[PDB]
Amino acid sequence: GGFRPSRVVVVAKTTRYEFEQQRYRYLLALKGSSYSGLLERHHIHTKNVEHIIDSLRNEGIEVRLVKRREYDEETVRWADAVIAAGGDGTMLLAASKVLDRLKPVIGVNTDPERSEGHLCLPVRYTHSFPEALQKFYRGEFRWLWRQRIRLYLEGTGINPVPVDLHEASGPQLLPVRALNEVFIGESLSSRASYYEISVDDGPWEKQKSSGLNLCTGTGSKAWSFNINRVATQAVEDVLNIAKRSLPLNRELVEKVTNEYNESLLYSPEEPKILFSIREPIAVFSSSRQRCFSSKVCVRSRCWDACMVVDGGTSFEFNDGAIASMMINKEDELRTVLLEQ
Amino acid sequence: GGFRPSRVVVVAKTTRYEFEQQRYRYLLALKGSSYSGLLERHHIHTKNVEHIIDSLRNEGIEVRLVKRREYDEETVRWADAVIAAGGDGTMLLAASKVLDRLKPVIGVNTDPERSEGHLCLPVRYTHSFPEALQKFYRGEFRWLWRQRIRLYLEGTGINPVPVDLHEASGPQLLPVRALNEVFIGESLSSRASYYEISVDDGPWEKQKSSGLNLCTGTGSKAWSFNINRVATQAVEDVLNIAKRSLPLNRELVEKVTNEYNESLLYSPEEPKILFSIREPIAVFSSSRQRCFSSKVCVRSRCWDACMVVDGGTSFEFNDGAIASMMINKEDELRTVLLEQ
Ligand SMILES: [Ca+2]
Ligand SMILES: [Ca+2]
Ligand SMILES: [Ca+2]
Ligand SMILES: [Ca+2]
């Protein structure tokens, strides 16, 4: 028990003001949808960021502060620990370049009232950040080894070169892990996807849908949730045709949805891949809207499709390519847990 | 009652063999996923096509036969009537270049065992096609004027130039109608969409989702179905938590889903736009999973998004642009109805 880092990398979200300051570097304001609080969005990110690095350096920890474009596998090795300073976006980016279950990576919600932060330290430590560093020293914290999906590409016509979205061959290992998910599907969101899935080495079934989602326990509150969740206005629709027991009050409408959406979440440390079929098109038959597994391999039959890991890295997955997802231990990422 | 066409355009799907014959014009076979029946897919499309045009010309109707690239607004005006010779794909393409509620357009399912055809003449007339032409002469048919969504772009940063996916400003009218749907949403399928909707001139609510669908009565069996339909394996999941009346047999599981999915379809002649929010993300609050309206206008707040009409034409719809959908009479498309 106990942990003080000697050197850390702070990798910072690039705010939406930073965006245009460099994007349109080629008054101002323009549309009323800016400046009013856009330069304030920026002012409070850099505020919090300076508080973090002021509070690191004031405890004698050595910090390099770097943005999306200057954060690489080389700086991560200098780091005893890694800090994402943004939202979960930033956390996912910071986890992308870590592949070592003993490097800790910790997210600080650099802007609470509009970032979400469900992978970062509580909103408390965003502004009382020595209180965090002290808890780390004194060991009043806990280790959360988060499960991560590992990728594997083979087949023919394949191309394992990764693509930063921020702009006859053997089984190659793709160089990102998935903290949140791996989303297979067609590029044109209107072109339907077609493939053959195989769960836990079971037989191959054909499928036609708007894509495949493949999440970790921790990623089950992210995309795999919006895929599969039900709506309270459409359980009233389902429970009223289920009329022709209960008198059906509004209190019940929420207590049937809230126990349904509660089964779609499992635990970060749990080592299962919850893989759902997004809007399946039921000929090729369907069933299993979703299910838990350990290994799933899908065979691409698409024209121009990608498999996309945590929304930031993309891989080609046109007809002839094969991918294989599996949780493996040396992938699990070392997060911390603190107090309200 | 009665209708004989004097000249017709037959516009033909380009088969998947035609694809590669010209795409890789830059033995053969390659992957086992071809040739076995790929050159047979082609052999039976051109077969049926020749039967159609043989059966036109043998009744003394004058036909120009043209493919995707040679079918234009000029040939549609020569035509007394227009024939799509493919699947609904082809039908939607053929309707794209017609904007005149008195031109008839008729689809012939050029390949029944793998095309679907739910906008074309029955599978009967694909091979007994004079039997169709005779029914047209003798008036043993019926006119189906199918409702069509009409598009309207304004605002700033906008760009109303259409994009064939087959590769301070006033309200401009976009030059495609929607037979099936109009799908607003972000281009990266992982980037979330954000916008402000306004139904029937009601107030503007903000929204965050994986896009917007906007279908006609006829388009309600297409995409708007896969968006909103329920699964029989996840009503068992909903009706078993709705346990803690019925004993729940498998016969019921289908009869509650089949009456739910039955309310998501309305009639082609019905002039309402059923607009659903695709996987809404409930801060900006949500409700109304879908609802009927006559006019809906949405205000783009996206970075790199398109609105896509019938899957074939795309328009930019980044922040600052405004679109407005509405059914108007001179759009309704003139289809026929025949017998089993
Ligand atoms: Ca300072
Ligand atoms: Ca290739
Ligand atoms: Ca002939
Ligand atoms: Ca623009």
From Swiss-Prot, chains A, B:
It is found in: Mitochondrion. Its EC number is 2.7.1.23. The modification N6-acetyllysine is found at residues 13, 221, 295. The modification N6-succinyllysine is found at residues 13, 206, 221. GO terms for molecular function: ATP binding; NAD+ kinase activity; protein homodimerization activity. It catalyses: NAD(+) + ATP = ADP + NADP(+) + H(+). The keyword Transit peptide applies. This is NAD kinase 2, mitochondrial. It comes from Homo sapiens.
